[PDB]
Design an enzyme around this catalytic site. Sequence first.
Site, PDB file in Angstrom:
ATOM      1  N   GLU A 102      14.345 -14.933  15.663  1.00 37.79           N
ATOM      2  CA  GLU A 102      14.968 -13.848  14.938  1.00 37.79           C
ATOM      3  C   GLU A 102      14.519 -12.495  15.444  1.00 37.79           C
ATOM      4  O   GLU A 102      14.708 -11.484  14.777  1.00 37.79           O
ATOM      5  CB  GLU A 102      14.734 -13.975  13.425  1.00 37.79           C
ATOM      6  CG  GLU A 102      13.282 -14.051  12.995  1.00 37.79           C
ATOM      7  CD  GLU A 102      13.132 -14.153  11.476  1.00 37.79           C
ATOM      8  OE1 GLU A 102      11.988 -14.279  11.000  1.00 37.79           O
ATOM      9  OE2 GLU A 102      14.157 -14.107  10.762  1.00 37.79           O
TER      10      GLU A 102
ATOM     11  N   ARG B 254       7.527 -21.314   4.059  1.00 38.87           N
ATOM     12  CA  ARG B 254       7.611 -20.185   4.989  1.00 38.87           C
ATOM     13  C   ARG B 254       6.516 -19.163   4.693  1.00 38.87           C
ATOM     14  O   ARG B 254       6.536 -18.481   3.656  1.00 38.87           O
ATOM     15  CB  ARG B 254       9.000 -19.526   5.009  1.00 38.87           C
ATOM     16  CG  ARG B 254       9.097 -18.348   6.010  1.00 38.87           C
ATOM     17  CD  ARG B 254      10.546 -17.981   6.393  1.00 38.87           C
ATOM     18  NE  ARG B 254      11.231 -17.205   5.362  1.00 38.87           N
ATOM     19  CZ  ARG B 254      12.424 -16.621   5.521  1.00 38.87           C
ATOM     20  NH1 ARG B 254      13.080 -16.687   6.678  1.00 38.87           N
ATOM     21  NH2 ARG B 254      12.959 -15.951   4.523  1.00 38.87           N
TER      22      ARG B 254
ATOM     23  N   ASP C 176      17.761 -10.388  10.413  1.00 35.81           N
ATOM     24  CA  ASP C 176      16.576  -9.903  11.144  1.00 35.81           C
ATOM     25  C   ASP C 176      16.909  -9.714  12.621  1.00 35.81           C
ATOM     26  O   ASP C 176      16.557  -8.706  13.205  1.00 35.81           O
ATOM     27  CB  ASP C 176      15.387 -10.848  11.021  1.00 35.81           C
ATOM     28  CG  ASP C 176      14.490 -10.500   9.859  1.00 35.81           C
ATOM     29  OD1 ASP C 176      14.317  -9.296   9.590  1.00 35.81           O
ATOM     30  OD2 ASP C 176      13.955 -11.424   9.219  1.00 35.81           O
TER      31      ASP C 176
HETATM   32  O1  LIG Z   1      20.132 -16.463  -0.417  1.00 38.29           O
HETATM   33  C1  LIG Z   1      19.361 -17.361  -0.871  1.00 38.29           C
HETATM   34  O2  LIG Z   1      19.751 -18.458  -1.387  1.00 38.29           O
HETATM   35  C2  LIG Z   1      17.868 -17.125  -0.806  1.00 38.29           C
HETATM   36  C3  LIG Z   1      17.324 -16.286   0.057  1.00 38.29           C
HETATM   37  S1  LIG Z   1      16.897 -16.730   1.737  1.00 38.29           S
HETATM   38  C4  LIG Z   1      18.095 -16.020   2.905  1.00 38.29           C
HETATM   39  C5  LIG Z   1      19.214 -15.322   2.433  1.00 38.29           C
HETATM   40  C6  LIG Z   1      20.145 -14.758   3.332  1.00 38.29           C
HETATM   41  C7  LIG Z   1      19.981 -14.887   4.721  1.00 38.29           C
HETATM   42  C8  LIG Z   1      18.867 -15.603   5.189  1.00 38.29           C
HETATM   43  C9  LIG Z   1      17.936 -16.153   4.292  1.00 38.29           C
HETATM   44 MG   LIG Z   2      14.410 -13.364   8.801  1.00 39.61          MG
END
Ligand SMILES: O=C(O)/C=C\Sc1ccccc1
Ligand SMILES: [Mg+2]
Length: 709
Positions: free
Chosen positions: A416, A323, A444
């Site tokens: 998003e 990403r 988001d």
């Molecule tokens: O939480 C994790 O394992 C790592 C971070 S990415 C993320 C966390 C919460 C919502 C969307 C993406």
């Molecule tokens: Mg996001």
Amino acid sequence: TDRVSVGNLRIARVLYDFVNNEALPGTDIDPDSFWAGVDKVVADLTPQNQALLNARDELQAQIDKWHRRRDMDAYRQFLTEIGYLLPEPDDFTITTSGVDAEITTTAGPQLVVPVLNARFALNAANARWGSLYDALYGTDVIPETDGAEKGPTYNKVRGDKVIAYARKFLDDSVPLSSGSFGDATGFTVQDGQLVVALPDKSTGLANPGQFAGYTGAAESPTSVLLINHGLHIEILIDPESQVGTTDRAGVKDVILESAITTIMDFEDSVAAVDAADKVLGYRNWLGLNKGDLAARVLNRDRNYTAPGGGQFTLPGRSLMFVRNVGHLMTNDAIVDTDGSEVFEGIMDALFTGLIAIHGLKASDGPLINSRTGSIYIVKPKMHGPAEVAFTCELFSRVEDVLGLPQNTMKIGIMDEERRTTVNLKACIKAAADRVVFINTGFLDRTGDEIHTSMEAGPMVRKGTMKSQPWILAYEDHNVDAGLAAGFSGRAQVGKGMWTMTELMADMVETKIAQPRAGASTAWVPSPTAATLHALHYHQVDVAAVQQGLAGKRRATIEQLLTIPLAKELAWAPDEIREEVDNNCQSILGYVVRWVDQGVGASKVPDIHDVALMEDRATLRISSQLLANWLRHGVITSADVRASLERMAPLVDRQNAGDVAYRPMAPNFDDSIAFLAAQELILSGAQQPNGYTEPILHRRRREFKARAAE
Ligand SMILES: O=C(O)/C=C\Sc1ccccc1
Ligand SMILES: [Mg+2]
């Protein structure tokens, strides 16, 4: 200074050296030609990048003005007139090619991990095969009731519950011709077929085709491989083991193919604000693609014997995406002659793409990512089809710099942002030959919802948002658009992260709603989480679900455009106060680790001490909700100050276990973290699309600079 001059660019020496010494050798790209292309691509695409960000500003100003002096029909007509809501294109099918099976066909869990943490990245990459016994025993999926609690040493009553859970799963996923796995006594492979010895008559699989292979001698297999809905299950046989000895069939463990793909994140789960930080990230991405990252090492491929008789190999690793950061931010890792920082998204495309070439080759390191010759890039926070097209052109130009065939670099489009959501079909069309997924999420998108209609009025509470009409339509609309553009059998349709990392019983109970909605993938917070969520793809036949949904339109534009305004005086004073504290401690808990420690993803206790694993987008939603309440006189600036003050020492106590932690309270204005948190709220309404990175990056840079003196 400490920079290198390449045309109009001045490159941080640490980045220049990393690329020349580590990234470039073995790719067959001329170094001087590489840097020439960097300068060219940067000069060429920078003005359009800036044009697009200015357009975001222009549209939001118009919407802001609209709301200040004010039905759906006028509102919709307005959005259409200003260039926000664009016409829907004619039906089409995506033409993406060169895509791995893990993406086109297989449904299952998808892991997301901060690329700057070598230890997590390694575990994520290795999480493609995970132990079901470990996942059950170690979590609350098996109730820690009296007599079944996990203590310092192995509990057999708990283990016997782990075993029954697994046998129940086997029966349910790979049924026997007669009887159950619960009563098995042994396994043999006779004339290419699997035989299960029961305590009376033996039996075969009800569907003999679910038998995929074995290890050991065909007459006494050391393991048995099965397949269901495209996912492998492996029964390990070993009565000479801690667990196997109690097992009436000698079964040591049940292994599940789990995280079939993983996103190595440079964006919202990492804190990277300068050249040194970007290089740490790049070096790990390089280690992963070479197959030589170590902290703990990368798993090698898994060998089996086919039911008939020959040898075959299954990938031992999650297929990796990367990403990249989105279009907004710049980073001083490269600056121009005038001292102006270069857009970070352009740089990520060039550098993460170069590095990824190593993943398409075996030596020189030992291992491969994509067999089919693709590089998979997730692009976050795009707003509409013009921004999608720009990304595709960026990739096209990078491919040229790197000597790759056109459309090597595939795109994962995050839905998003509101302007993408309402123009989704055109966004997919803009990437018709590059797209390999679309996905939705909470944080988001809800932050953008709030910011976009900031001037419309007071929004409902953060908890309430999860079930609002706009977000339910949003979720359905994304699947609808995917399936109708031919995603089934072609590209992933993905849904959001389960954040509550300790509430695994709750995940297993409820996250199954996601494949039931036709999502071929969903995000999980850990390897353990990936293993448990995999159970859902065995219960639910996603392919069949998607076939059912094709041709259905489940969401209207009206539903999408439905602003989550609160009803007149919805809240009592105490509920108002709970929400403020909730959002203030959400911000403080995350910001204090980000600014002080450069940690963007960790298990953070919330106000009820529930461990949540969220990324930076938690800052966006929480700061936007508070900015909105402040804008419309739900709360006062003294209320915010008071809450930040109450919650800070609570956050301090939550970080007691940390060696490096330095407490925010009782002296708040001496804490850059605290000030950062306060700024996110009080300046929230003024940030571009409510993005938090501009403030966050400045505050972390401030912290890093003070710490150097
Ligand atoms: O939480 C994790 O394992 C790592 C971070 S990415 C993320 C966390 C919460 C919502 C969307 C993406
Ligand atoms: Mg996001």
